């Protein structure tokens, strides 16, 4: 064939740390369906937000939002334990159906996004050119987010352990750990990966008695 009707840009969802994760690759033929299983970002999370995105950039915010919805009613559990199957299905009329299903209960939520949604042809061309021109900064941002998500998890598990240690954490350890937590929380908002890893290391160093 010399003609294929395709979805012109990648379609996907935002995952932890604000990165786009692709479910349907750009230039996939329609109709098509693909699914992937995700989990929750933090312990005892009772909902997930499904933010649907069109585009080629690794930073979620740089892509075009097509819609968003929550799946709630998730049984409280440690981060990473729930299983939420996200399915994207584009039918022959170019309508995109996106559903999220909790594999434990079968509870499901879905939206339908009309064929005209998203970026127009000129915007599509720009988006592809921008993604090519920014391929390195995008890979760096991916690496940054991997480190941020680790730092964020370490913040949370540390704060939990401080709560589990209560009156028993010597004041001197508590002060040091709180200052290190603040320092890591501040570093996580920046874009310097090594600064975050350093603050995780400093937090680890003041945390040794905390086990």
């Amino acid at each position: 064939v010399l003609l294929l009707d395709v979805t012109p840009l990648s379609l996907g969802i935002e995952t932890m740390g604000g990165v786009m994760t692709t479910l349907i690759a750009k230039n996939t033929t329609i109709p098509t369906k693909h699914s992937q299983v995700f989990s929750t970002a933090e312990d005892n999370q009772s909902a997930v937000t499904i933010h649907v995105l069109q585009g080629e950039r690794k930073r979620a915010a740089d892509n075009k939002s097509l819609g968003q919805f929550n799946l709630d009613g998730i049984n409280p559990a440690p981060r990473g334990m729930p299983q939420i199957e996200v399915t994207f299905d584009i039918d022959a009329d170019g309508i995109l159906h996106v559903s999220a299903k909790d594999k434990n209960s079968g509870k499901e939520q879905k939206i339908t996004i009309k064929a005209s949604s998203g970026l127009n042809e000129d915007e599509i061309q720009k988006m592809v050119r921008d993604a090519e021109a920014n391929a390195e900064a995008d890979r760096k941002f991916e690496e940054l987010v991997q480190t941020r998500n680790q730092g964020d998890h370490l913040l949370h598990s540390t704060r939990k352990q401080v709560e589990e240690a209560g009156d028993k954490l010597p004041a001197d350890d508590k002060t040091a750990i709180e200052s290190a937590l603040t320092a890591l929380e501040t570093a996580l908002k920046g874009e310097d990966k090594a600064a975050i890893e350093a603050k995780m290391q400093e937090l680890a160093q003041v945390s040794q008695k905390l086990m």
């Binding site: 935002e14 995952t15 994760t21 992937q36 995700f38 937000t49 990473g80």
Partner: peptide, 7 residues
């Protein structure tokens, strides 16, 4: 490991 969602 599976990717994660906030919310």
């Amino acid at each position: 490991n599976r990717l994660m969602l906030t919310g």
